[PDB]
Design an enzyme around this catalytic site. Structure first.
Site, PDB file in Angstrom:
ATOM      1  N   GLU A  11       0.792  -1.240   0.000  1.00 12.69           N
ATOM      2  CA  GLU A  11       0.000   0.000   0.000  1.00 12.69           C
ATOM      3  C   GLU A  11       0.814   1.274   0.000  1.00 12.69           C
ATOM      4  OE1 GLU A  11      -3.110  -0.190  -0.523  1.00 12.69           O
ATOM      5  OE2 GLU A  11      -3.804  -2.197   0.002  1.00 12.69           O
ATOM      6  N   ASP A  20      -6.023   6.973  -5.415  1.00 17.98           N
ATOM      7  CA  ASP A  20      -5.700   5.592  -5.560  1.00 17.98           C
ATOM      8  C   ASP A  20      -5.573   5.169  -7.036  1.00 17.98           C
ATOM      9  OD1 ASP A  20      -7.976   3.980  -6.357  1.00 17.98           O
ATOM     10  OD2 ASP A  20      -8.562   3.431  -4.279  1.00 17.98           O
ATOM     11  N   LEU A  32      -8.972   4.171   2.276  1.00 17.58           N
ATOM     12  CA  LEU A  32      -9.942   4.793   1.395  1.00 17.58           C
ATOM     13  C   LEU A  32     -10.847   5.753   2.122  1.00 17.58           C
ATOM     14  CD1 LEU A  32     -11.066   5.266  -1.164  1.00 17.58           C
ATOM     15  CD2 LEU A  32     -12.966   3.717  -0.675  1.00 17.58           C
ATOM     16  N   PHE A 104      -8.499  -6.737   3.023  1.00 21.24           N
ATOM     17  CA  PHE A 104      -8.159  -5.391   3.278  1.00 21.24           C
ATOM     18  C   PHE A 104      -8.263  -4.549   1.984  1.00 21.24           C
ATOM     19  CE2 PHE A 104      -5.109  -1.953   3.253  1.00 21.24           C
ATOM     20  CZ  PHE A 104      -5.223  -1.472   4.565  1.00 21.24           C
ATOM     21  N   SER A 117     -12.300 -19.700  -6.343  1.00 22.60           N
ATOM     22  CA  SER A 117     -10.979 -19.712  -5.788  1.00 22.60           C
ATOM     23  C   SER A 117     -11.010 -20.142  -4.318  1.00 22.60           C
ATOM     24  CB  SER A 117     -10.322 -18.327  -5.854  1.00 22.60           C
ATOM     25  OG  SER A 117     -10.359 -17.718  -7.134  1.00 22.60           O
ATOM     26  N   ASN A 132      -6.848 -19.559 -11.042  1.00 23.13           N
ATOM     27  CA  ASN A 132      -8.192 -18.982 -10.940  1.00 23.13           C
ATOM     28  C   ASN A 132      -8.188 -17.497 -10.466  1.00 23.13           C
ATOM     29  OD1 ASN A 132     -10.986 -18.592  -9.347  1.00 23.13           O
ATOM     30  ND2 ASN A 132     -11.110 -19.897 -11.192  1.00 23.13           N
TER      31      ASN A 132
END
Length: 164
Positions: A11, A20, A32, A104, A117, A132
């Site tokens: 991040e 972003d 965010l 997250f 998945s 996948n």
């Protein structure tokens, strides 16, 4: 390596409002603020999240406080989620960090959408799940980070993070 160091890698840390990858108003370590277009909406979210007039700017301490909350909310979210919980309980510790990283980044809802998945992860079908997972909009938009996560899932090691 731990979940916080791993997320700090993926991040980054910005002490001022920033946009972003997706176009959104974000602050500190992947926090965010709003999906909305207004830098003013974002500055408001921001003061409310901190409890002070920030004018788009925060200290480390603050970014780290935010980050503590986020990770905390990510893990309790998984544990509360009926799709998520059983996958999590079934995994080893490193793989756990990987699911946490995804949650997250793209919220609980987004993750639980990865129905196929999740099923392979639970079955411990490592290679299949890796493939996948690569077939996603997520992989396509942020290939390098998505790849690190996928590797973490395929291997159960911190290898992808050991050059960074």
């Amino acid at each position: 390596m731990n979940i916080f160091e791993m997320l700090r890698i993926d991040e980054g840390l910005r002490l001022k409002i920033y946009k972003d990858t997706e176009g959104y108003y974000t602050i500190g370590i992947g926090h965010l603020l709003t999906k909305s277009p207004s830098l003013n909406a974002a500055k408001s979210e921001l003061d409310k999240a901190i409890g002070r007039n920030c004018n788009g700017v925060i200290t480390k301490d603050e970014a780290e406080k935010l980050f503590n909350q986020d990770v905390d909310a990510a893990v309790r979210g998984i544990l509360r989620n009926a799709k998520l919980k059983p996958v999590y309980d079934s995994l080893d510790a490193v793989r756990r960090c990987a699911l946490i990283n995804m949650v997250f980044a793209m919220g609980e809802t987004g993750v639980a959408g990865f129905t196929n998945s999740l099923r392979m992860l639970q079955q411990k079908r490592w290679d299949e799940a890796a493939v996948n997972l690569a077939k996603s909009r997520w992989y396509n938009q942020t290939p390098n980070r998505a790849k690190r996560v996928i590797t973490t899932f395929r291997t159960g090691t911190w290898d992808a993070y050991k050059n960074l």
